Symmetry: D2
Subunit: 108 residues, 4 copies
């Protein structure tokens, strides 16, 4: 999958992926974007903890929490409560979108 | 693919798809959401033209244009110029998100 | 997913899918290949039962069984015990391959 | 895509991919299987050339050729002319299957 929907959570070792791109939430708490084996981006918080989990919040903030729930990193885009999506785009860019503007409402 | 990014266009017969869900821009100009062979949603503009094309605009408006460029249908969510995405979600709901809030900027 | 590996089973309502193609094992026991809403192929065994399940066997036979385990349909390609795969190809052709010839053995 | 069909070719930098798994035909001619950034398997032919291309042949042989068309590596599973598939399985195992046993013939 390449979309982390608001209200979801990438646990340790979990990741979004598309093509050769992998946005992985590592064990050492380093959220890294790899292009195959090459590191492309990273929160550079590796080692600050263990077993962290990336969380896309409804307020719009993309936060990396440690097991103790202390936030290690965050996009700081928190504020408007609503629906949001974190997408690992086809052009190798992880982007946050929101709030939702329209929907067919065909939701299950 | 299950994401129509703003600035993109589904031509006739083109579609977003995910699982058994297919959000197709048909020849008869009817934008329909199918769950396998069952119709789920539709703009109900079938027959109003031929060779239409769905366009996700930068202003946020999701418009169905005919070859003559006259809009046959639209979400009317036009307004704020920016980046938007139309996603055929995993829960069978086509939703529009925007503007973009954050990005790793790792864009190619 | 677009691959049913030998030893696996599509239950009722389950399906392989790729693009707009959906190879679905229906409730009425009719294994049908749809191209969006258009039926393309089918075992034409609909109604012969309820709650059937498609099974890709290790002997190479692709069988549609009813809950009572009586085979309703089968490719009759049974014979050589081994590894096989049923693939819903990108050209809209469901094909069976086997046995396996080579592998990196990198298996988890 | 995670299937290289017989008669197809991964050029330099091209790759099969699934999940965090990427079976890439590198510039240095090293066909490597990575699990994110960790190398898992490799033909160990890196440096033997430049701009190689992986080819899944109809005879069943999986060969890595150099631009000069000299084979640098091969699975040596050549022999029976027919249809074959190289699949980067969900269990992180690259496997070759063939020949084809059955098909709905729905081919486009
Ligand atoms: C400096 O290493 C940290 O940041 C790198 C990117 O800047 C990551 O690649 C790295 O993770 C990978 O390597 C470490 C070992 O150095 C390993 O523990 C991890 O599982 C990855 O393989 C680390 O986060
Ligand atoms: C300052 O709080 C915002 O930013 C923090 C990280 O910089 C987040 O931890 C914080 O999230 C928490 O509070 C919000 C609002 O109460 C809640 O919705 C979320 O689940 C966390 O508990 C917020 O984003
Ligand atoms: C009433 O038919 C229109 O709207 C339906 C949904 O309400 C669509 O399913 C339908 O499209 C499909 O059927 C038509 C023929 O009726 C066919 O031209 C089209 O390619 C689809 O198969 C149509 O849009
Ligand atoms: C003749 O109907 C059977 O075979 C068709 C293909 O030849 C299928 O499309 C059909 O399944 C679909 O329609 C039936 C109702 O006729 C419905 O029960 C099923 O869920 C599908 O929508 C059926 O198998
Ligand atoms: C020993 O290096 C070769 O084999 C490795 C696996 O055994 C590959 O990872 C490696 O490729 C990667 O690194 C090289 C530089 O050492 C780089 O040229 C290539 O693009 C990959 O990043 C190489 O094939
Ligand atoms: C010994 O030939 C087989 O193995 C070689 C590598 O070990 C392959 O290069 C070779 O392939 C070539 O010949 C076959 C048969 O003529 C042809 O189909 C293929 O396209 C290559 O030209 C064969 O696999
Ligand atoms: C109630 O939530 C659902 O519907 C909204 C819009 O109606 C979507 O944005 C969201 O992702 C879900 O599909
Ligand atoms: C009123 O203009 C807006 O809406 C129409 C359709 O309603 C689009 O054609 C146009 O580009 C704008 O999005
Ligand atoms: C310049 O556009 C790119 O970057 C923005 C955010 O920087 C994304 O929203 C967009 O989809 C592209 O990837
Ligand atoms: C004759 O036996 C074979 O074929 C039938 C269906 O024809 C399967 O049920 C069985 O497991 C074997 O594959
Ligand atoms: C033991 O089974 C595994 O390995 C064989 C080849 O070794 C594959 O064909 C099969 O799908 C599994 O990945
Ligand atoms: C003629 O080739 C097509 O059909 C055969 C079986 O008929 C498949 O194996 C192959 O991949 C193609 O789809």
């Amino acid at each position: 999958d390449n979309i982390l929907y608001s209200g979801e959570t990438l646990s340790t070792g979990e990741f979004l992926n598309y093509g050769s791109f992998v946005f992985i939430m590592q064990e050492d708490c380093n959220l890294v974007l790899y292009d195959v084996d090459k590191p492309i981006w990273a929160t550079n918080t590796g080692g600050l903890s263990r077993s962290c989990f990336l969380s896309m919040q409804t307020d719009g903030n993309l936060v990396v929490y440690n097991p103790s729930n202390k936030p290690i990193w965050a996009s700081n885009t928190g504020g408007q409560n609503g629906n949001y999506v974190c997408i690992l785009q086809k052009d190798r860019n992880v982007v946050i979108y929101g709030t939702d503007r329209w929907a067919t409402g065909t939701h299950t």
